[PDB]
Design an enzyme around this catalytic site. Structure first.
Site, short mmCIF file in Angstrom:
data_model
loop_
_atom_site.label_atom_id
_atom_site.label_comp_id
_atom_site.label_asym_id
_atom_site.label_seq_id
_atom_site.Cartn_x
_atom_site.Cartn_y
_atom_site.Cartn_z
N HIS A 33 42.94 41.23 46.02
CA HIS A 33 43.04 42.58 45.45
C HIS A 33 42.89 43.64 46.53
CE1 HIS A 33 41.85 41.23 41.25
NE2 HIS A 33 41.33 40.24 41.96
N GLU A 115 38.26 41.42 47.25
CA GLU A 115 38.82 42.76 47.34
C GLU A 115 38.93 43.23 48.77
OE1 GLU A 115 39.74 45.05 45.20
OE2 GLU A 115 38.96 44.54 43.22
N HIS A 153 46.80 39.99 43.11
CA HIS A 153 46.59 40.41 41.73
C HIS A 153 47.94 40.77 41.09
CE1 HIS A 153 43.92 42.76 38.64
NE2 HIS A 153 44.42 41.65 38.15
N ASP A 163 48.46 45.66 43.42
CA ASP A 163 47.70 45.25 44.60
C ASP A 163 47.85 43.76 44.88
OD1 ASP A 163 46.08 45.24 42.16
OD2 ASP A 163 44.36 44.66 43.40
#
EC number: 3.5.1.28
Length: 179
Positions: A33, A115, A153, A163
Site C-alpha cells: 500500500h 504501507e 492494493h 495504491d
C-alpha cells in the site's frame, strides 16, 4: 527478523486495531500500500494515530472524514526507511477492505499489509526499497508462499484503490527479493 510475529528491528507501536486470522491461518500474500497524512504530506505522527485509533479529527480538515475508520496495517515504512510495526504478522490487520485475490475474498484474512509512506506518482526512496525488501525477505523465510504472492492494493481492489500506483517499481523491488 521475526520474534513471535514481530520484526526484531522495527519500532513497535502496538495497535488495538487487530483481531485473529480465521483458523490460525499462516499468511501467504503480501499486499503493498501507500499512505500519506495529510494527503501528499510526509513526516507527521498521523499515520501512527490513524492506525491506533487515536487520530484528532480536528487537527486537519481531511482527518474529520477518516476519524470514523477502524483500520491498521502490519507495518509502515517511512521516507527515511524507518520501519514501524503495529500488528504482529500472525494476526489480522485491517488494511485490505473489500477485496479479492485469485478468487478468494476478504484478503485481510491471509495477507500481510505493508504501507509505504508516499503517493501514486512520486518516486519512493532508496531506503524504502531496501527496507521493504529486508522485511519481505524476512517474511518469506517464515512464509515461503509469500515469494509467489506479492501484490498492490490496487490489484485486489481494482477500481477502488490505486495504491501503490505507477510510482512503485516492481522491478527494483523484485531485484532485491530472495537474493
Amino acid at each position: 527478523l521475526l520474534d513471535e510475529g514481530w520484526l526484531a528491528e522495527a519500532r513497535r507501536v502496538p495497535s488495538p486495531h487487530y483481531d485473529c486470522r480465521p483458523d490460525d491461518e499462516n499468511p501467504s500474500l503480501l499486499v503493498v500500500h501507500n499512505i500519506s497524512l495529510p494527503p501528499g504530506e510526509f513526516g507527521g505522527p498521523w499515520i501512527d494515530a490513524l492506525f491506533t485509533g487515536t487520530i484528532d479529527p480536528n487537527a486537519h480538515p481531511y482527518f474529520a472524514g477518516i476519524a470514523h475508520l477502524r483500520v491498521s496495517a502490519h507495518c509502515l515504512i517511512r521516507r527515511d526507511g524507518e520501519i514501524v510495526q503495529y500488528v504482529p504478522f500472525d494476526k489480522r490487520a485491517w488494511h485490505a477492505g473489500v477485496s479479492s485475490y485469485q478468487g478468494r475474498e476478504r484478503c485481510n484474512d491471509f495477507s500481510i499489509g505493508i504501507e509505504l509512506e508516499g503517493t501514486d506518482t512520486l518516486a519512493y526512496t532508496d531506503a524504502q526499497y531496501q527496507q521493504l525488501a529486508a522485511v519481505t525477505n524476512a517474511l518469506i523465510t517464515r512464509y515461503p508462499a509469500i515469494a509467489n504472492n506479492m501484490t498492490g492494493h490496487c490489484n485486489i481492489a481494482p477500481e477502488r484503490k490505486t495504491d501503490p500506483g505507477p510510482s512503485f517499481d516492481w522491478a527494483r523491488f523484485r531485484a532485491l527479493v530472495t537474493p
